[PDB]
Design a protein around this ligand. Structure first.
Ligand SMILES: [Ca+2]
Ligand SMILES: [Cl-]
Ligand SMILES: [Fe+2]
Lengths: 117, 114, 117
């Protein structure tokens, strides 16, 4: 029922521990963890950090970020929708090679327009 | 019958089979460190994080839909398929897709896009 | 303490187990898991796989992906910012019906421009 701490060490070098001095739960030295649940998995904590040197895959019909999503680079594979003001700066925004901020068109008198005003 | 371990800092680790609920509460940090993989297989994953969720990895892959309130892309990207913007402006370096115009070829200006 | 393994089975059929032979932590047969913590929850492992048939919700002011983010489809609800080169192909990029790579304009003499060069 009441325990001073928790330290469980396994013969493969893994540990499961709870240290009340630092208030830290640690599971370390394992090869795999798997959790299978019928309902939900929830974390309520200010910071979640996932440090994955290969990949994080979210295999789900929908990932929802309730506020801002920031990424280094973006790859969209199969299209999508955007609403609200989308502000691009600092490079080109090109579609089929046509650059929004610099493109020109043949004009209606046989010349060429300037780039966008 | 059920797991209930209480610590002097107020932390609790519990499994209650009468609700089938695993609960860890009252702790400051949790961490799981593994050499292979961590997998969760469950219909709903819910993270309530008042500061931030950081995915520090070479690639995050969302297999289907990704929905966000706002988006910030820092170092460019690629998009394939039809991308349909509505409801405000899509601008690049100040030039707005749906309303921009150009100097015309006779010294006036074009209209906006058709 | 040292333990040779961990195999805890409960009467609902749930199992919490650590098997040192394969260094595998497995939790199964539960309905919900919840962690509440005042500081952080961190996972450090090369590969994370989340198989969530309903949805993954990240309810936070900010989700940060440090490098690449890849998705099948994208839905931005309330705007955004982009920097760097954004290269679109394999369809149209349209805003309020106006398509970057094919749009024309009325010309300055009353005709119509060509599409973008
Ligand atoms: Ca003209
Ligand atoms: Cl013109
Ligand atoms: Fe144009």
């Amino acid at each position: 029922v009441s325990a001073d701490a928790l330290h469980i060490r396994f013969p493969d070098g893994a540990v499961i521990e709870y240290e009340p001095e630092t208030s830290a739960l640690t599971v370390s030295g394992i090869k795999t963890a798997s959790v299978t649940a019928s309902g939900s998995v929830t974390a309520t904590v200010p910071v979640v950090m996932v440090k994955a040197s290969t990949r994080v895959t979210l295999d789900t019909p929908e990932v929802v970020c309730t506020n801002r999503l920031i990424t280094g680079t973006l790859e969209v594979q199969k299209g999508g929708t955007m609403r609200g003001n989308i502000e691009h700066t600092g490079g080109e925004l090109s579609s089929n090679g046509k650059v929004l901020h610099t493109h020109k068109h043949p004009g209606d008198s046989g010349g060429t327009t300037g780039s966008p005003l």
